[PDB]
């Protein structure tokens, strides 16, 4: 039948006041015969009406996709506000209900450590700089890399891993040209988590 996904907003969006965090309700496998979908949005029970309604999108075994995006307020989500999407379709026994909300629990700050390139690492054309992060709750986090107030996009970051005490850890590796590193350029590890003063911290790293 028609399946539904309700996605939380990018943690950056929720922690960056200059950005629009949005919850997203995706409906897939809607039929050619019964295409209309009605969305109902609720914030802790109270219905709300501002949601955007995107047009249908061609899919596969003569199907459609429909998405409705609802903006949220930085402080709202952060507070623990529960968001509910209600999907209705003539092909639905009952209307489907999805519930997303920031994880409840006593918040904790991420500890951040940096690892410069090893000796073997330093023989290659491209060296990788590494960033370790632990003891954070909840798992929603954004880690990015910069150098001289410009973004560095050549990195991967592992999903948060559950720790035995309830907090979360991860690592992120940025790869760069050895010359850029040899030149003296500073590279910074930007961590945004709710439990950081102003949501922002940054460890940096250079030779030697």
């Amino acid at each position: 039948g028609p399946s539904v996904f309700l996605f939380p907003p990018k943690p950056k969006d929720t922690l960056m006041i200059s950005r629009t965090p949005e919850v997203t309700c995706v409906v897939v496998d809607v039929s050619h015969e019964d295409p209309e979908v009605k969305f109902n949005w609720y914030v802790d029970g109270v219905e709300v009406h501002n949601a955007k309604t995107k047009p249908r999108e061609e899919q596969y075994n003569s199907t459609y996709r429909v998405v409705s995006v609802l903006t949220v307020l930085h402080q709202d989500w952060l507070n623990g506000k529960e968001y509910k999407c209600k999907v209705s379709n003539k092909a639905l026994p009952a209307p489907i209900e999805k519930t997303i909300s920031k994880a409840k629990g006593q918040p904790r700050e991420p500890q951040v450590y940096t690892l410069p390139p090893s000796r073997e690492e330093m023989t290659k054309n491209q060296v990788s700089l590494v960033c370790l992060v632990k003891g954070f709750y909840p798992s929603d986090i954004a880690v990015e890399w910069e150098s001289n107030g410009q973004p560095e996009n050549n990195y991967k970051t592992t999903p948060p891993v559950l720790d035995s005490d309830g907090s979360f850890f991860l690592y992120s590796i940025l790869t760069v040209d050895k010359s850029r590193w040899q030149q003296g350029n500073v590279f910074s590890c930007s961590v945004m988590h709710e439990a950081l003063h102003n949501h922002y911290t940054q460890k940096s790293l250079s030779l030697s």
Binding site: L15, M16, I17, S18, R19, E144, E146, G149, Q150, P151, S190, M192, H197, N198, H199, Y200
Partner: peptide
């Protein structure tokens, strides 16, 4: 207290 990320406003206290 305001923090910035790549010139974009993060947060204020």
């Amino acid at each position: 207290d305001c923090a910035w990320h790549l010139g974009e406003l993060v947060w204020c206290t």
